[PDB]
Design an enzyme around this catalytic site. Structure first.
Site, PDB file in Angstrom:
ATOM      1  N   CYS A 165      -3.097   1.832  -3.511  1.00  0.00           N
ATOM      2  CA  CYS A 165      -2.629   1.478  -4.723  1.00  0.00           C
ATOM      3  C   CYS A 165      -3.400   1.566  -5.761  1.00  0.00           C
ATOM      4  CB  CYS A 165      -2.032  -0.105  -4.637  1.00  0.00           C
ATOM      5  SG  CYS A 165      -0.623  -0.189  -3.651  1.00  0.00           S
ATOM      6  N   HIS A 296      -4.661  -4.912 -12.926  1.00  0.00           N
ATOM      7  CA  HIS A 296      -4.029  -4.292 -11.754  1.00  0.00           C
ATOM      8  C   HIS A 296      -2.707  -5.079 -11.547  1.00  0.00           C
ATOM      9  CE1 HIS A 296      -3.016  -2.114  -8.260  1.00  0.00           C
ATOM     10  NE2 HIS A 296      -2.909  -3.167  -7.619  1.00  0.00           N
ATOM     11  N   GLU A 307      -7.553 -11.873  -9.330  1.00  0.00           N
ATOM     12  CA  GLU A 307      -8.288 -10.771 -10.413  1.00  0.00           C
ATOM     13  C   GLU A 307      -8.556 -11.631 -11.531  1.00  0.00           C
ATOM     14  OE1 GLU A 307      -6.739  -6.590 -12.433  1.00  0.00           O
ATOM     15  OE2 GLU A 307      -5.461  -7.875 -11.529  1.00  0.00           O
ATOM     16  N   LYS A 326       2.537  -3.221 -15.019  1.00  0.00           N
ATOM     17  CA  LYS A 326       3.482  -3.342 -13.939  1.00  0.00           C
ATOM     18  C   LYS A 326       4.564  -4.577 -14.325  1.00  0.00           C
ATOM     19  CE  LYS A 326       0.237  -1.946 -10.087  1.00  0.00           C
ATOM     20  NZ  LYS A 326      -0.945  -2.007 -11.248  1.00  0.00           N
ATOM     21  N   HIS A 331       5.666  -1.942  -9.402  1.00  0.00           N
ATOM     22  CA  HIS A 331       4.532  -1.251  -8.805  1.00  0.00           C
ATOM     23  C   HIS A 331       4.908   0.175  -8.268  1.00  0.00           C
ATOM     24  CE1 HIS A 331       0.889  -0.818  -6.790  1.00  0.00           C
ATOM     25  NE2 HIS A 331       0.844  -1.891  -6.215  1.00  0.00           N
ATOM     26  N   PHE A 390      -4.998  -2.755  -0.508  1.00  0.00           N
ATOM     27  CA  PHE A 390      -5.430  -2.941   0.663  1.00  0.00           C
ATOM     28  C   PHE A 390      -6.862  -2.217   1.254  1.00  0.00           C
ATOM     29  CE2 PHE A 390      -0.667  -4.100   2.136  1.00  0.00           C
ATOM     30  CZ  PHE A 390      -0.791  -5.007   1.085  1.00  0.00           C
TER      31      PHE A 390
HETATM   32  O1  DYF Z   1      -3.842 -13.455   2.644  1.00  0.00           O
HETATM   33  P1  DYF Z   1      -2.897 -14.421   2.570  1.00  0.00           P
HETATM   34  O2  DYF Z   1      -2.870 -15.315   3.589  1.00  0.00           O
HETATM   35  O3  DYF Z   1      -2.419 -15.198   1.309  1.00  0.00           O
HETATM   36  O4  DYF Z   1      -1.347 -13.675   2.680  1.00  0.00           O
HETATM   37  C1  DYF Z   1      -1.011 -12.418   3.096  1.00  0.00           C
HETATM   38  C2  DYF Z   1      -0.487 -11.390   2.016  1.00  0.00           C
HETATM   39  C3  DYF Z   1       0.802 -12.077   1.404  1.00  0.00           C
HETATM   40  C4  DYF Z   1      -0.183 -10.226   2.420  1.00  0.00           C
HETATM   41  C5  DYF Z   1      -1.523 -11.578   0.863  1.00  0.00           C
HETATM   42  O5  DYF Z   1      -2.634 -11.182   1.577  1.00  0.00           O
HETATM   43  C6  DYF Z   1      -1.314 -10.835  -0.226  1.00  0.00           C
HETATM   44  O6  DYF Z   1      -0.561 -10.729  -1.388  1.00  0.00           O
HETATM   45  N1  DYF Z   1      -1.962  -9.330  -0.433  1.00  0.00           N
HETATM   46  C7  DYF Z   1      -1.744  -8.468  -1.476  1.00  0.00           C
HETATM   47  C8  DYF Z   1      -1.760  -9.062  -2.706  1.00  0.00           C
HETATM   48  C9  DYF Z   1      -1.929  -7.915  -3.902  1.00  0.00           C
HETATM   49  O7  DYF Z   1      -0.864  -7.812  -4.760  1.00  0.00           O
HETATM   50  N2  DYF Z   1      -2.983  -6.895  -3.831  1.00  0.00           N
HETATM   51  C10 DYF Z   1      -3.457  -5.851  -4.592  1.00  0.00           C
HETATM   52  C11 DYF Z   1      -3.560  -4.846  -3.619  1.00  0.00           C
HETATM   53  N3  DYF Z   1      -2.888  -3.917  -4.132  1.00  0.00           N
HETATM   54  C12 DYF Z   1      -1.737  -3.394  -3.761  1.00  0.00           C
HETATM   55  O8  DYF Z   1      -1.331  -2.814  -4.850  1.00  0.00           O
HETATM   56  C13 DYF Z   1      -0.743  -2.965  -2.579  1.00  0.00           C
HETATM   57  C14 DYF Z   1      -0.486  -1.773  -2.660  1.00  0.00           C
HETATM   58  C15 DYF Z   1       0.748  -1.255  -1.423  1.00  0.00           C
HETATM   59  C16 DYF Z   1       0.047  -0.793   0.116  1.00  0.00           C
HETATM   60  C17 DYF Z   1       1.138  -0.556   0.963  1.00  0.00           C
HETATM   61  C18 DYF Z   1       0.638   0.601   2.096  1.00  0.00           C
HETATM   62  C19 DYF Z   1       1.314   1.029   3.178  1.00  0.00           C
END
Ligand code: DYF
Lengths: 403, 73, 360
Positions: A165, A296, A307, A326, A331, A390
Site C-alpha cells: 500500500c 495515507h 497517522e 481515499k 483504497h 503492512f
Molecule cells: O492491531 P489491532 O489490534 O488494532 O487490529 C488489527 C487490524 C484491524 C488488522 C489493525 O492492525 C489494522 O487496522 N491495520 C491496518 C490499518 C491501516 O489501514 N494501515 C495502513 C497500512 N496500509 C494499508 O494501506 C494496507 C494495504 C493492503 C495490504 C494487503 C496485502 C495482502
C-alpha cells in the site's frame, strides 16, 4: 548542486475519471468512485460495493502487446503509461533506445487471474483444467516489463516494487534517485492494482471494510472500500524537459523511507514520523513551508488515529491541512499513493486542495483541518504525500511548484 | 455452558496461546489475536459475529456470551 | 576502486545444498546434485523430483512462537538473515543501525498462502471464512518486513519482483539508494519457496512436450557496504549492474547488449573476465544466454564455476545463488584476487540483467 527532477506527464485510470482532465474535475468536485462490484461474485460477503474503474477499454490504449499477455492490473499499468507519455508530449525520438527506468508499484498484481485459475481447478476437480494463458501472466515483474514492450523501449530497468500500500511512493522515489544519480534522464513511475476477491475478503476478515462509505478522520469511521486503477508519472530531468519545451506540472523535491520494525499489520506513529522527517530533509523544506498533506488516510480506526499522531509529533499543535484522497477513490492499493501523488501535482498546478469527503464529525483523536466535503482554492506550492503499508513500510513524497 | 465451552476454550487457546480459564489482554494479547479467535468461532459454528463486538471479548467467558448470542443459543 | 563503490563484505545462503554458507560452498566445490523426491505430505504434484532445502522445518529452525502460520518464503529469508548477522553463539557479529537498508527480490511471494486463502474463500461456508492469522504472511513484502522486525532494522525496507533477475534488480536498487545517501549499508538478496501451488502453476505454463520443470528453492543474502568505510574486509566490489527488456523475442541479442554495456560501464574488457555464471534456465532462452556469453568471454570463464542447473530452477533465488557461487569459488582459489566475475540472468517475463564484480 543536485539534479532537478520535474513531472511532465500524468496517466490516470481511476474510479473518478480516466485521464488528467476528468481526474482533475473529479478531485475538484469531491466525486466518489463507489459503485457496485462487477468483477467477481459477492454472494455471502453481505455487501456489494467497491471503487472499480467503470468503463475500461484496453484496445483503445494498447496497440503492440497482445491483450491476453496481461491481466487487468497489467492492462491498467500499460494504458496509464501510454496516457502519461502522451500527456508529457514525448515522441519516439524522445524514447526508443533512450536509457530509462520503469517502476510500477503493486499490492496484489494479477490476483484475480490467480482466483480464476483456482476456479478452473475446483470446477474440474483437477489442476490440469487450469488455463496456461493465465498461469503465464501472474508474476508481478510483468507489470513493469510489459510497459517497456508496449512503448518499444529495450534499454530499461523494469522494476515492480511490491511494498503493497506504499508502493506508488516507493516507485516515484526510485525514479527520483535514478535521475538524480545521473544514470538516466527519464523515468516512468507509479502503481497499478485490480479489484479482486482476495483484497475484499482480506479486509472483510480484518473488520476494516466499511458497510457504507469511506470517512477518513471521522469519529465514526468504519474502514475502507477496495479500489483499483493506475497512476503513472513521467519524471524527467529539468534539462530534458526544458530542452524539448515540455509543460511541467510540478517538481519532485524529495522523499523519505522508514521501517517501523514493530508490528506486521499495525501502523506505528514513530515510524511514520521518521519517514516524514527524512522526506522534509531530502526535499530541503521546513515544516512551515508545507501547504497541505495528502494523508495515507485509509479510513480505518487504527490508520487515521496513528497517522494524525505522527503528523502532530512532527508539526506540533497547528499542523498543515490534512486531506484523504481515499475518501473519493477508496483504497487503490499499490496505485493509491501514485494517484495521490498525481492529485498533489494537480493541486500545486491548479491552486486547489482536494476534500476529505463523507465527513460528518472530526475525531477528537484526529485534531486536523481535513478540508471537509468540498475543495478549497488556495495558494498551493509545496505538498506532502504520505503512504504506508503492512510490514511497517513507510514512504513520504514531497512535491513543489516549478518556477 | 456444556461441551461447547471445552471446544471454545480449545479454539481460544490455539489462537492466543495459554491453557487456563479466567484478562484478555494482560495475558499475551494483540488485536490480531482477538480477530483470530472471533474468526475461528465463526468458522466452527457457521455463525456471523459482528466485529464491533471485539472490545467485549475479554475473558474465556465474555466471549461465550457473544458466541452464544450471535449463534441464537 | 571508483569514489563510492559498493562492496560485498558478507554472505549467507539457505539452498538445495543445505542450510548455511558452509553447506553451500561445499555443494559448489563438489558440483553436487540436490534433486530428491517430494514429501507425499505436500499432496499430489505434477512431477516427481524437486530441489528442496534438505532438513528445513520452520518450527525447528525458528522456534515454536509465531511460526505455526508462517510461510516458507519468510522462514527461508529469516534463517538466511541469522546466517548473515549472527556469530556461532547467536549474538550480533555485524553491527546495523537506522542507515542499514533491506531489499529482497521475489517472484510472486507465497503462492501457497494466497491459494490456500482463496481456496478456503471458495469452499468454506462463507467466503470470508479465511485463516486470519495467515493474512500477514501473504503480503509480498512480509519477508523483508519480518527481517526488519527480527533484527531491529528501521532503515529503508523494500521488496522488488522480477523472478530470476530480481536479485540483480535488488542489488541495483541498493546501489542507487546508497549512492544517494539513503543508507550506509544494505542487506540485499532474493528468495523463492517451493510449494505445490508453484509446482502446478509452472506445469500449467509448460508447453506439451517440453521438459517437466525441476524446481529449486532458498534464499541468498549479501551484506553491502561502501568501500571507503567498510567495517569489514571486502569480498567483492560491485562495478556495474545493467539491465534490459527483450522486446524482440531474441534473448541472445539482449544478453549480448546487456553484458557489453555492463563491461563498458565497469571500465573492463570481456578478456579480463575470470568467471562468468549464466543462470542456465532449462529453455531455448537459457541456451541463447550461454551462447551469447561464450561468444564474448574466455571459455575458461565459463568452466570456472559449476552449473546452476544442479540447484534446479531456483526462481527468484537464482541471481543471489549465482553471486554466492562466484564468492565460494573466489574463496577456494587465491588466484581470484583482483579478477573480474560476470553474473547474468534472464527471466521469462522479458528481462535480462548482468552484474560485473571485482573479487578482492
Ligand atoms: O492491531 P489491532 O489490534 O488494532 O487490529 C488489527 C487490524 C484491524 C488488522 C489493525 O492492525 C489494522 O487496522 N491495520 C491496518 C490499518 C491501516 O489501514 N494501515 C495502513 C497500512 N496500509 C494499508 O494501506 C494496507 C494495504 C493492503 C495490504 C494487503 C496485502 C495482502
Amino acid at each position: 548542486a543536485r539534479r532537478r527532477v520535474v513531472l511532465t506527464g500524468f496517466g490516470v485510470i481511476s474510479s473518478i475519471g480516466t485521464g488528467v482532465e476528468e481526474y482533475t474535475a473529479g478531485l475538484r468536485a469531491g466525486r466518489s468512485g463507489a459503485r457496485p462490484i462487477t468483477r467477481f461474485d459477492t454472494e455471502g460477503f453481505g455487501q456489494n460495493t467497491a471503487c472499480e474503474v467503470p468503463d475500461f477499454e484496453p484496445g483503445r490504449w494498447i496497440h503492440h502487446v497482445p491483450l491476453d499477455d496481461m491481466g487487468r492490473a497489467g492492462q491498467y499499468a500499460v494504458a496509464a503509461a501510454r496516457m502519461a507519455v502522451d500527456d508529457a508530449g514525448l515522441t519516439e525520438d524522445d524514447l526508443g533506445e533512450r536509457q530509462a527506468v520503469i517502476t510500477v508499484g503493486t499490492t496484489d498484481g494479477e490476483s484475480h487471474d490467480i482466483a480464476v485459475l483456482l476456479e478452473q481447478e475446483l470446477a474440474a476437480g483437477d489442476p490440469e483444467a487450469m488455463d496456461p494463458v493465465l498461469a503465464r501472466r501472474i508474476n508481478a515483474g510483468r507489470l513493469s516489463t510489459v510497459i517497456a514492450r508496449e512503448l518499444r523501449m529495450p534499454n530499461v530497468e523494469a522494476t515492480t516494487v511490491t511494498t503493497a500500500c506504499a508502493a506508488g511512493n516507493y516507485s516515484v522515489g526510485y525514479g527520483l534517485d535514478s535521475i538524480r544519480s545521473g544514470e538516466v534522464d527519464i523515468a516512468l513511475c507509479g502503481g497499478a492494482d485490480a479489484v479482486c476477491r482476495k483484497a475484499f475478503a482480506l479486509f472483510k476478515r480484518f473488520g476494516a471494510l466499511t458497510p457504507d462509505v469511506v470517512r477518513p478522520f471521522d469519529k465514526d469511521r468504519q474502514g475502507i472500500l477496495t479500489g483499483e486503477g493506475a497512476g503513472i508519472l513521467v519524471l524527467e530531468s529539468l534539462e530534458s524537459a526544458l530542452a524539448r519545451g515540455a509543460r511541467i506540472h510540478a517538481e519532485v523535491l524529495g522523499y523519505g523511507l522508514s521501517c517501523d520494525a514493530a508490528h506486521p499489520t499495525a501502523p506505528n506513529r514513530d515510524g511514520i514520523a521518521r519517514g516524514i522527517r527524512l522526506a522534509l530533509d531530502d526535499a530541503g523544506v521546513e515544516q512551515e513551508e508545507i501547504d497541505f498533506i495528502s494523508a495515507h488516510g485509509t479510513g480505518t480506526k487504527a490508520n487515521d488515529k496513528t497517522e494524525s499522531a505522527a503528523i502532530v509529533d512532527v508539526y506540533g499543535d497547528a499542523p498543515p491541512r490534512t486531506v484523504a484522497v481515499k475518501s473519493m477513490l477508496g483504497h487503490s492499493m499499490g496505485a493509491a499513493s501514485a494517484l495521490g501523488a498525481i492529485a498533489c501535482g494537480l493541486a500545486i498546478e491548479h491552486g486547489f486542495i482536494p476534500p476529505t469527503i463523507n465527513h460528518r464529525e472530526t475525531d477528537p483523536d484526529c485534531p486536523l483541518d481535513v478540508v471537509p466535503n468540498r475543495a478549497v482554492e488556495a495558494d498551493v506550492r509545496i505538498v506532502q504525500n504520505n503512504s504506508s503499508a503492512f510490514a511497517g513500510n513507510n514512504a513520504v513524497l514531497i512535491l513543489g511548484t516549478y518556477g | 455452558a456444556p461441551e461447547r465451552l471445552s471446544r471454545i476454550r480449545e479454539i481460544i487457546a490455539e489462537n492466543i496461546d495459554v491453557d487456563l480459564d479466567g484478562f484478555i489482554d494482560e495475558l499475551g494479547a494483540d488485536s490480531l489475536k482477538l480477530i483470530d479467535v472471533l474468526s475461528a468461532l465463526e468458522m466452527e459454528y457457521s455463525i456471523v459475529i459482528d466485529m464491533n463486538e471485539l472490545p467485549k471479548m475479554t475473558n474465556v467467558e465474555a466471549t461465550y456470551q457473544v458466541t452464544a448470542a450471535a449463534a441464537g443459543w | 576502486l571508483p569514489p563510492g563503490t559498493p562492496v560485498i563484505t558478507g554472505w549467507s545462503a539457505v539452498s538445495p545444498y543445505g542450510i548455511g554458507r558452509a553447506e553451500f560452498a561445499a555443494g559448489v566445490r563438489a558440483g553436487a546434485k540436490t534433486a530428491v523426491k517430494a514429501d507425499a505430505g505436500l499432496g499430489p504434484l505434477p512431477s516427481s523430483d524437486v530441489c528442496t532445502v534438505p532438513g528445513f522445518d520452520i518450527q525447528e529452525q525458528l522456534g515454536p512462537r509465531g511460526t505455526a502460520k508462517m510461510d516458507r518464503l519468510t522462514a527461508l529469508a529469516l534463517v538466511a538473515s541469522d546466517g548473515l548477522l549472527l556469530d556461532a553463539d547467536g549474538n550480533r557479529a555485524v553491527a546495523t543501525d537506522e542507515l542499514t537498508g533491506v531489499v529482497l527480490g521475489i517472484t510472486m511471494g507465497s503462492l501457497e498462502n494466497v491459494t490456500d486463502f482463496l481456496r478456503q474463500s471458495y469452499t468454506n461456508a462463507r467466503p470470508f471464512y479465511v485463516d486470519a492469522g495467515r493474512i500477514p504472511f501473504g503480503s509480498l513484502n512480509h519477508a523483508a518486513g519480518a527481517t526488519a522486525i527480527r533484527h531491529d532494522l528501521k532503515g529503508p525496507n523494500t521488496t522488488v519482483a522480477g523472478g530470476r533477475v530480481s536479485g540483480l534488480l535488488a542489488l541495483n536498487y541498493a546501489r542507487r539508494l546508497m549512492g544517494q545517501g539513503r543508507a550506509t549499508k544494505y542487506l540485499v538478496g532474493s528468495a523463492e519457496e517451493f510449494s505445490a501451488a508453484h509446482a502446478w502453476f509452472e506445469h500449467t505454463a509448460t508447453a506439451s512436450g517440453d521438459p517437466a520443470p525441476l524446481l529449486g528453492e532458498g534464499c541468498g543474502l549479501f551484506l553491502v557496504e561502501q568501500a571507503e568505510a567498510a567495517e569489514r574486509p571486502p569480498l567483492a566490489a560491485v562495478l556495474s549492474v545493467e539491465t534490459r527488456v527483450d522486446i524482440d523475442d531474441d534473448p541472445g541479442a539482449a544478453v549480448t547488449a546487456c553484458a557489453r554495456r555492463a563491461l563498458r560501464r565497469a571500465g573492463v574488457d570481456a578478456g579480463e573476465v575470470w568467471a562468468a555464471v549464466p543462470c542456465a534456465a532449462p529453455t531455448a532462452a537459457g541456451r541463447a544466454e550461454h551462447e551469447a556469453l561464450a561468444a564474448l568471454v574466455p571459455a575458461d570463464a565459463l568452466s570456472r564455476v559449476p552449473s546452476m542447473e544442479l540447484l534446479g530452477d531456483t526462481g527468484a533465488a537464482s541471481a543471489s545463488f549465482q553471486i554466492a557461487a562466484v564468492l565460494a569459488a573466489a574463496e577456494a582459489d587465491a588466484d581470484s584476487r583482483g579478477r573480474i566475475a560476470l553474473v547474468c540472468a534472464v527471466d521469462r517475463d522479458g528481462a535480462v540483467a548482468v552484474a560485473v564484480l571485482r573479487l578482492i
